[PDB]
Amino acid sequence: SDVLTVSTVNSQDQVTQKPLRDSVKQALKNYFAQLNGQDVNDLYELVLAEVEQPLLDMVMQYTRGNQTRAALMMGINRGTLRKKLKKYGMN
Amino acid sequence: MFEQRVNSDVLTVSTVNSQDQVTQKPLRDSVKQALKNYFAQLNGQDVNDLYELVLAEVEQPLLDMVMQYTRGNQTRAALMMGINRGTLRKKLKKYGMN
DNA sequence: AAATTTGTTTGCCTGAGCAAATTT
């Protein structure tokens, strides 16, 4: 059903999958609890930078450095991918 | 007075370790693992949309939490996300969040 | 009734090329 999942453990040491979206939700619930009405400036860039870094990181590992195959898997423009890599200084 | 809290530690998730001690670990790592599993469980065809896949999986909950936190308010929402109110409307429509 | 938000209009990623360089 879901293709992006992570591994969880419960009290009874069973390992079970939960969707990544649930983890993201958890992280933000946390972030929000810790701040007390202190305003949030750029939450979108925050999350995005937090999520692109390991995305680029895993497809550059998977395509063994091949930016062309990487860009194809991701479904984005080769130039775009260059841009993103320069942005997080993985290059 | 102020201890450093780095970017990987701002958005975090509760993990359980080899000693049943609960610890906060980066959201980065959750994404990382979801992808490692998505790869290892891929026998073995091509992928053409990894980016939109991840992106939707991460936008949906970000949009959800922000709206809960602004009690439905789209102006405050778009303002704290740091995006134009119009595109916030666009994303919201795209995910059926109305 | 005044202030704010909504819903709606307006006007800063990509394919294709191409030579250099790298892998096959």
Add this chain to the structure above:
DNA sequence: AAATTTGCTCACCCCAAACAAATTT
């Protein structure tokens, strides 16, 4: 020596702004 990939140029979404209408303070 061929094929592929890279680095680099070219020129089809996000944004502020505006405004009336709805809503919330």
